[PDB]
Amino acid sequence: SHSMRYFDTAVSRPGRGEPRFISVGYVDDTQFVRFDSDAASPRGEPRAPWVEQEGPEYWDRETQKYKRQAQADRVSLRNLRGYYNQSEDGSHTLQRMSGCDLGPDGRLLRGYDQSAYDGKDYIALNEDLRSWTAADTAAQITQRKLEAARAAEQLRAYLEGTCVEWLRRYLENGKETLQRAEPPKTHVTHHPLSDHEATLRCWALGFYPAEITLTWQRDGEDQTQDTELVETRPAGDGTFQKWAAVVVPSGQEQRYTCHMQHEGLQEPLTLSWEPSS
Amino acid sequence: HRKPSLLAHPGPLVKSEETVILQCWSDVRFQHFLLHREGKFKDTLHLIGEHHDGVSKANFSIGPMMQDLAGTYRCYGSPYQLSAPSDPLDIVITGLYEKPSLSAQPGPTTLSCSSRSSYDMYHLSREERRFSAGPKVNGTFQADFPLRCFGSFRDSPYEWSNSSDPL
């Protein structure tokens, strides 16, 4: 089971030029493409080697789509400023998620084209790829225009056809990096907090994909209600990191174990703080 | 300081991506021409003056016709001193939605333009005139002209839907 998603951000900047349109593309947790309407010569660029060998005819087409989308999102920002009766002097954000989810069989699991306005859900293509769901009465106007323009047909065809095909191709051409397990490297660190307290931090480093779970357990008790869990970080090289900390009484840490389930493993790992001596 | 003529070639109603030309001219010999669009996206363009047969003309190429290029245009004919604004020219983009259907009662040669896409307005033309739709019982929306058609939405009366069946 895999995924391909495009994330778009259009931000209006009234007195300082056209709205900035940024679009990034992902296969699962791996970015492969990028577009920035503020670059010197705005062009869709590759960000993963398994799209660098696509012809210039590919990148020219993608770039044309991106420029047109920048214009259409400028227009959309204007229209939504109108719909909500908002001033022409504020900065507003329009976001989009589009793309296809592939089941374990490779067939289309789910087609997505959803849009948020100022971080709030605005309008979403429904799973039948034939109807829309509008969050308020301004989005109903957008729904009527979308319907009259047969937008769900073009989108339904992109999602059912081009999206799934090219995701299959991306997945094969980068079968190694993309379909590899890649489990996390682990260890447990000990840090003196104060008299009668000290922190145990459990590390998971260098893993792909990003989905992972670590939990601290004292002997049996599940201290998630007391565990400090940071959100999963990018290490910077396409892999991910995470840690979980628990505050414990000094000299009582052997009761604690870190339990770690991830894709690149079978047996969920259980590791404890081990001083070397 | 005399208002010029603003003429849309080959007409005021443009289809998407189709470059259309705005001609501004007068027997007054300004060496500068300023074109102003009011509407969704206000803008002002500068062409330098052309002189031919006693008329100063200016051909404003407005390019691949997009939504942001529809609106109401005027032009003004010494860079600072400008003329009185020309008569206004409503320039619309067409080609965005599904075209409606034209029934008539009774004769073929009380019209009607129909679609179940709930347009807010409808329009006409020959080689204009408007009316806003009113819904009904079978799930359709309707307007009819007492006596070529287009649809449009209330918030954008310059973005029209597709050249319907001729008649």
Binding site: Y6, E62, K65, Q69, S115, K145, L146, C163 | Y97
Partner: peptide, 9 residues
Amino acid sequence: RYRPGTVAL
């Protein structure tokens, strides 16, 4: 492969 163009919102 990015999605194809659509009318504005």
